[PDB]
Design a protein around this nucleic acid. Structure first.
Ligand SMILES: Nc1ncnc2c1ncn2[C@H]1C[C@H](O)[C@@H](CO[P@](O)(=S)OP(=O)(O)OP(=O)(O)O)O1
Ligand SMILES: [Ca+2]
Ligand SMILES: [Mn+2]
Length: 428
DNA sequence: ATTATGACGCT
DNA sequence: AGCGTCAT
């Protein structure tokens, strides 16, 4: 009882942009606003591959990883914006720069952890404490939470009507005398996230969703519950009902083989069902670390910190060469290594000026035709100068005798992927 | 021919 | 180090 940790020590949010690359293109081109539209990479093969989809277009069944020609079968009036191509490859700079706009605004409110190009975790624990005793124990008005859902409420017929009804039940039950009530802390966190999201939209034009809970996994889960342009508070008390029908694969890190093994080995389907195993039972099947993590996580408890990191730790350039485009000659491999290295140099040089740091290691990865995996081979060398010709020459030297062909001018087996990655940054 | 990334774990 | 997993 008195000694049972409940994982209610922190207030953590996750802010995730709505259909991010699409909003970037819609800001630039007003003709795309409020339309079914998608962002596509390349064009010659099946109209290009879709990587982002507006909510209007999702209503027609358009999804990521769909060919545009196929999306057009579902949505004939679908509008498209193409990813920039430079040096023969897709170039994501516009979206990385739009990401920085958003991350810099979020950083004004609290320290953030960049979790992807379009989302960040926020540790709001300290900000909440400050706002709380600036409030003098004043009640929190529904007006301060105009886009907030309280997961699990109302309990005991507009969609907005349901939202407000749930919010009212929550606020009516809130205890404001205690400055250490976890539920109150989450509520103040939600107030701050409304402010953050309003600042993002005002200053960039971009809308986003957010989750507010006591840890990163619940905040991420919460965020997705009421997308787009809304935020969701998942309280500790909401967890048993929420998890009672929550497929295991929906929890971050359980979407792959581990999650499948939990389902298989234990013969369960939902996150809540994990509570019926001992910590040692879970460790026996899934390992010491995973076992302890699952034991806590199915009770809504997780301790992974919000890391103070706003900038990516690596800067990489990659390109696939599928089917008959697979690289089969030396000069082909060399030319594409150079294209990659030139984009990498551009990004590295910018990074050095912006962020006062230098990469020290170059990682070279390839895939060969007929191979199992994402990467067939990974090798490193020293990154001593931001020079594309040197980096491409060094990458070639490193992947040199992967070529099994006796013919030296020819390359076999053909390469279906090249990847250059700058790593191991040092302050400068 | 589901591409371009990017973080972290294992040994 | 080099490979694997999982995520966006
Ligand atoms: N698998 C993959 N390949 C290439 N690019 C991706 C992929 N997944 C996501 N992205 C890009 C393009 C997205 O706009 C952006 C953010 O991804 P997410 O958050 S999964 O989806 P969004 O497009 O922002 O819609 P949503 O968050 O509102 O559901 O990253
Ligand atoms: Ca998003
Ligand atoms: Mn995202």
């Amino acid at each position: 009882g008195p000694h049972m940790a409940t994982g209610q020590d922190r207030v953590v949010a996750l802010v995730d942009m709505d259909c991010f690359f699409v909003q970037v293109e819609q800001r630039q081109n007003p003709h795309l606003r409020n339309k079914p539209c998608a962002v596509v990479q390349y064009k010659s093969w099946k109209g290009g591959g879709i990587i982002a989809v507006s909510y209007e277009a999702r209503a027609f069944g358009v999804t990521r990883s769909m060919w545009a020609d196929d999306a057009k079968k579902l949505c004939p009036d679908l509008l498209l914006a193409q990813v920039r191509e430079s040096r023969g490859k897709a170039n994501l700079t516009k979206y990385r720069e739009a990401s920085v706009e958003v991350m810099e605004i979020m950083s004004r409110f609290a320290v953030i952890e960049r979790a992807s190009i379009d989302e960040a975790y926020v540790d709001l624990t300290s900000a909440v404490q400050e706002r709380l005793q600036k409030l003098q124990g004043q009640p929190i008005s529904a007006d301060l939470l105009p886009s907030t859902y309280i997961e699990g409420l109302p309990q005991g017929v507009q969609k907005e009507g349901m939202r407000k009804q749930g919010l009212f039940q929550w606020l009516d039950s809130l205890q404001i005398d205690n400055l250490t009530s976890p539920d109150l802390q989450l509520t103040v966190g939600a107030v701050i996230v409304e402010e953050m999201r309003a600042a993002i939209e005002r200053e960039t034009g971009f809308q986003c969703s957010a989750g507010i809970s006591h840890n990163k996994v619940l905040a991420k889960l919460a965020c997705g519950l009421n997308k787009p342009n809304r935020q969701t508070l998942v309280s500790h008390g909401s967890v048993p009902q929420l998890f009672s029908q929550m497929p295991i694969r929906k929890i971050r890190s359980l979407g792959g083989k581990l999650g499948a093994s939990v389902i298989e080995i234990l013969g369960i389907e939902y996150m809540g069902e994990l509570t019926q195993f001992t910590e040692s039972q879970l460790q026996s099947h899934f390992g010491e670390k995973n076992g302890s993590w699952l034991y806590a996580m199915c009770r809504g408890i997780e301790h992974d910190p919000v890391k103070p990191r706003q900038l990516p730790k690596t800067i990489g350039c990659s390109k696939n060469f599928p089917g008959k485009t697979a690289l089969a000659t030396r000069e082909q491999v060399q030319w594409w290594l150079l294209q990659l290295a030139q984009e990498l140099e551009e990004r590295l040089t910018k990074d050095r000026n912006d962020n006062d740091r230098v990469a020290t290691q170059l990682v070279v990865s390839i895939r060969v035709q007929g191979d199992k995996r994402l990467s067939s081979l990974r090798r490193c060398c020293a990154l001593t100068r931001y020079d594309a010709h040197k980096m491409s020459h060094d990458a070639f030297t490193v992947i040199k005798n992967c070529n099994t062909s006796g013919i030296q001018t020819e390359w076999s087996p053909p390469l279906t992927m090249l990847f250059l990655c700058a790593t191991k940054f040092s302050a400068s």
